[model samples]
Target: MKFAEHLSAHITPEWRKQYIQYEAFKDMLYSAQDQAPSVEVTDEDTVKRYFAKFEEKFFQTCEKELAKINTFYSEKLAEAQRRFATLQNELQSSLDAQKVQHRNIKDLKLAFSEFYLSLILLQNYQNLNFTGFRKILKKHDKILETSRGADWRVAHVEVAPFYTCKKINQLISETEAVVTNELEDGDRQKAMKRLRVPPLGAAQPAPAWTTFRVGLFCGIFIVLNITLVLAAVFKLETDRSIWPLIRIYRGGFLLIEFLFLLGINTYGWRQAGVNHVLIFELNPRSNLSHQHLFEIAGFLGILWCLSLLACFFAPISVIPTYVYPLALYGFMVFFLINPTKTFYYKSRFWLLKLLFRVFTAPFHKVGFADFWLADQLNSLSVILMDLEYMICFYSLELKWDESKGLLPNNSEESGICGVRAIVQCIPAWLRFIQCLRRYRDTKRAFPHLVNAGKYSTTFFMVTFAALYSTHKERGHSDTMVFFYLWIVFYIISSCYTLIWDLKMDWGLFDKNAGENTFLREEIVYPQKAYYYCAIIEDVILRFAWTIQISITSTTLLPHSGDIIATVFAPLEVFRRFVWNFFRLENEHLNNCGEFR
Candidate 1:
């Protein structure tokens, strides 16, 4: 095809309609106007004169055509103006009608707002008539639905607010249906059960004896605890021989508490055992009854308690020290071993997996104790119980040991206590590191663990430092300085952890307020006494532990430095007063759910 024929075939009238081809044609004319005169100019006079003549002739003809073009376009422009005036009048009329419609729409919106407020009032303080309200809302919905047409969109300037009302109408209509369904089913009261907040007059009267019993026990416990501490302090100041006996008594109390915790926790776990489906899924033939486990655990716990008390009088030589070491090792073994293959396989850390495999290899190889019941027995609770036993063994044997005779004068016993002091910090450090690892691995595990780790690390390290400093050859001044430093570190660390916990709780409160409807509802009438109970409980417990450790370590001074005792005496009494005042168990009375 020829070039012009090909171009014309490709670029049809349709292409001109789709794009602005006229702009390009106008640009070409503009270019011609600028360059056309230059092309007609010549260097020769005769040629130039002929060119001028041609140019003049061309311009005169062009001017004549341009005048006619202007006249024709002027007539068209006047005709278009008249048509615009007519369109403007029609547009003004439509806009006026739209203004009236917009006013009506606003009034409808106000009515809907009032309707929503009434629903809120009904839900809050009055019984809602589902059929009546449903009919009223439906009438409005019908009105709005019918009013929507060509000018509906124009009447609304704010698109989102207009749609928002529609969305709300849809929601309330669905809610009406749900209410009706609930009424028909007679499940309205049952449906309300899921709401977390308590209703008016639903408060149950607390048992009066619970308060009296708790207060009585707490008072007796506190009194005895303070008496023992004071007695120890006085004895330490007077006679060094009496100090070892005080250590034995102190260790016994801790052992008893530890054993009691073990029993209590074991019983709780028995009461709240794992899902039965889990047991069936893991081992269908397993005979895992809570009663069976409870019986064995209780028996062992009783035996453990008896052994701990027996340590107070059992002669160090007759008992065979190696037996205690063996028992401690056995306890450690329980902590280290993984009883279930599932736990072994599920473990993500290589070191933990290897340790688990190594410890349980013999049992697996022998194909014994493969039941899920065995796995449940050898669980986190068991490991913790075993850890408690280890602590008990340490207290009963090493710290409170009387094997070497007389207390402060016995070089052998001092060496043993010194070694024990430094060694005790090792487990504390390891525990803190474990918590740190878990916190770093997954922060959502437990915030309380972080607080626990921080307190444990600080308390143990400071205690270790105090014990180590006692044996130093640098005399009383250096020892006193170290003691002062330890006290400062302990106070600062405890306060820091306490404040951080409160800060985290504050953040959680804000989050709960924003997310939980029940919490937001209670914002205006918050039972702060109940809320602060948990915070107060946690703070007091943490601080109490700190005070006990600090005071006990101070009282057990290796040297009879009267000046040191005098300085710490007031501090001890002050701490005790603070402890006693804050020991109320109001938190136990209320239900705050889990600690964050």
Candidate 2:
């Protein structure tokens, strides 16, 4: 009974509800069974001929019914198996379709995002182009008019459409529309739909003044650097060793001078866009033609380069190698010099006052030569003495029976301390000057500093070499190896310091005060050229600083010629190449601006 009831309860809800009602009616019928049994009985034959026929028909029916039941069960089993297989196939197809739909949607989303980013980027580029184009057009009216012959000139020609405000609005509307369309997608195809045409850059452009100024500084700096390098190289053709002055000029003074100039320029530009004439303008006037000016600059630049080369190959005992450069460096100090009084007189703020005080404090009450002499006491006091002593001993050794003073060949002790000492001193001397106050004009400072600085390191090296050679010739490895090791530490520390000054924080000084003024040129109209030019020059000059550093960084000892390959070589190459490219590009753009 419980099983039957549970089976009835377990029926489908729709069927169970009806079955419960039917059961209630059936129970009522059972309860009323004896009350009114209205059984109508008709008088009829109990057994007739039909009954006999029914009996025969009944027996035949039983045989037929049994066969029908077996066939019915067999048919039902086959139908159930077929339905199960059909359902499995349908389910697999649905799953496959669903997976495809999901993948398509994902792909569409990715495409949409990429397209959106691209459109935004394009807009920015377009805006930049449009603005730059305007500046160009203003410079070159003929080119602007000539472009009207082309169909693509529509945007540039039409004033109303090209109006800054209108262009800006159009860009905003188009950007918003594109973004909205992409974001509204629910279907895979809708999400994937890419624009037939992507949007252009914003029409309204921001002022390029800031970028132009920066670029101008860069460009002028490069032209000046190259010019200075050429000048140094040329100057050295006649006097190679003395050429280190250019290196000192570049490494020691010019760099710091540039930073100070940059700060001045920035302040000037901020205070008065184009009319802020600096202190140099008030000096004794000399008007040189642009062509002549460039020639002069180029000559000076070559001098700086030659100075560097001479320092690289010069003998260690060459006293003038360091002295002349230091003198030239001293000249640069004079170049950047204004009466220390002027800085204080011009100063309106505590900071400016403090800077002037700190920089010129040493020379506050002394004559310029006295100030310079005070600074040079180190080298004057010891450097020459050391050099003279080494020169005396080395000359004595060289004059000694050849085999007795020279490292014969292929010995582990050969040329170790000597070559290294000479190489190392170049960087150390440059940095030493850089640390001093004179080499502040990058154009004239570091190149000279680096050139001169090498002498100190090389002097030590030659002395060591003379000593080492003496030991090697005597077949004494102990003294030779000991000096070699000493040179190694000396070279490492010296080069590291030198490289740091060159790349990190060195100043440059100008050659002569008169020459500094001579090199100064007024920035002409569309001051953008100066900005770009300065950047280019700074990069080149900075590169020169790094190369000066390489002398010590990549030693000549232990069988390496120059350490450029492992060290700053690649960076130098990159810096040089980039400097050229940027210089060219800026020149082209500035030319275009002028042409407009």
Candidate 3:
């Protein structure tokens, strides 16, 4: 019953015509249903023709809604465009004429910020009207199985001027560039902070209590971490099974890493006007904020540390060493599967839903959320594959043997196959299939396949690495071919991935980069130096593995291959943390088409 009642809930007070007459549409469809019940129209041809009349009326009604939406959106866009255009000219001339008053004035900043605010409102209007159109059309198809509604979407809805116009996105981007360059003293972050206007509403900064809660959790988390380390230093490892603790460390590593990177990235996206909610298709009202991420990370971090500490302190005579980890796993499972609504239930569920979509790639439609999240897997590919070891480590063991990881000793002696290489290729494999899926959907060979090839290059590199390790362990004397192939493919994938990141992802080193040298126009991040250091660090870290400097043989510094990988694994996570900032920034620019 509330369906009709709720239909009008989303309408604007002044502009009732902006939304469709859903009640009218529903009643008409109901009348159509009534006509089907009139036995006189039992014949297919008679009934079909009757519905045809209905279709014509529906089109006219739909067209009216479209016209209203388009006209209103265009008016706002044109107004915003002209207003911002002259403002930029005024500011530009003011800058060029070397006028001191223009440099010192606050009025332009206020005016320009409001101009940006209006553009964001225009975006909401488009999003709002688009939702109305999609809903009524979807309802039409649902209520009547006529299938004409499907055709209506393809033929009429697809090219609607309001739906297709991208000028608002461009205006938002250009506004940021001008604000940062001219008004905000060349501070990109500050400009974005000033101009941050999210979808659905204005910016909602974290509340005081929420910030306090996060800080409290973080403090407790730090105390627990330090206390645990101190306990370990006092021989806590000797008191318990190291294997259970090792698993805890691995999981804790990722949990904390995800928390820090995601929180930082969320904060960065919000502060820098990234419109990440739109990018990820999340509800801005209840979307996960950096505060939530930090609070969650802190709570879990504290809980896991406390549980491990309990394992050491709990007398083994009374309780088993494995019980704490088992309980910790159980608690985490419960949190994820929680039926209650307390802890961002929908947000948590959305994550799991997207997780499945990612794992089930190519089968599901690719979204920006899906692929952008999938790329994180590429950076964490090795560490994630280490999960296979943890799997078999638990599965194949009667008790603990050794905590060997990543290309670990073959399972024949070790029981379970640590040849986790089965999963090593999955990250690249996901991208390969996803790219193919994109090609299937869009029929675009240039980008989808080239991107696919970028992923494909890594497949060979991973396979060769596995083969090299395999042959050497099997006592094959001539393993150099495999090793050499590994290095060659490694170099190829390295350069290939790096190139894609710069040109395709970040849009750096462009000839047409107008204000910013090397990088293209419409960059959100103000610091040009950040891009240079980022490129330099990307090159350096990418080839860091290439050094292969026989650190093991050196007498000066202590070294082991596992430690080298251990360090590099976390190192890659950091690099990705850096990568997330620019990746979202570039995607933001691309949305507006201003990179050109």
* Best-matching candidate per TM-score: 3
lDDT of 2 at 49: 40
Candidate 2 per-residue lDDT, tens place, 7-90, comes to: 332322211222212233234333433233233453235333434443344334433433443343344334433533453454
Leading candidate by lDDT: 3
Question: Clashing residue pairs, candidate 1?
Answer: none
* lDDT, residue 385, model 3: 47
Regions more than 4 Å wrong, model 3: 1-74, 77-202, 237-244, 311-316, 400-419, 544-559, 591-596
TM-score, ranked from best to worst = 3, 1, 2
* Predictions in order: lDDT: 0.37, 0.36, 0.69
lDDT of 1: 0.37
Q: After the best TM-score superposition of candidate 2, give how far the Cα of residue 44 lies from its true spot, in angstroms.
A: 79
- The candidate with the higher lDDT, 1 or 3, is 3
lDDT of 1 by residue, 1-596 (tens): 34223222222121122221223333433443444334346446664564455445533443343344334334433443453345345444644766566665444333333343333322321111122222322332343243222232234212323222233335445444443342225464542332222221111222465445435544555565455456445533343343333333332333333333333433332222212212122221122232333333333334343333233333457553324434533653453354655322332233354434333442332111122122122112213322443454455544345443323443323322233333334334443444444455446456536544554755554574555356454455457666666767777766875664444422224334553422221221124453456456656655654543443333354464323333333333333222221111111111121211
- After TM-score superposition, what is the CA distance of residue 515 in candidate 1 from its true location, in Å? 15
lDDT of 3 by residue, 1-596 (tens): 55344434333323455666677777887877786644464777777777778889888888887787778888877888789879988777777876447544576777787787677666766776666667778878887775777788788877988889988898888888888876777889988877785533224667798899899988988888888888778845343335334534555566567777789888877666676776787644457778888888787777788876775566444455556665776787788788888787987888789889989998997888888778888666654644555565556643544322221332333322324544756777887898899888878687788889887776676566656666766778778987788778878877887887788777787788987887877666657898888888887776653222112111113224435655666666677777788888877667521111
Report the poorest 10 consecutive residues by lDDT, candidate 1: 584-593
Q: How far is candidate 1 from the true structure (C-alpha RMSD, Å)?
A: 31.0
The candidate, 2 or 3, that scores higher on lDDT is 3
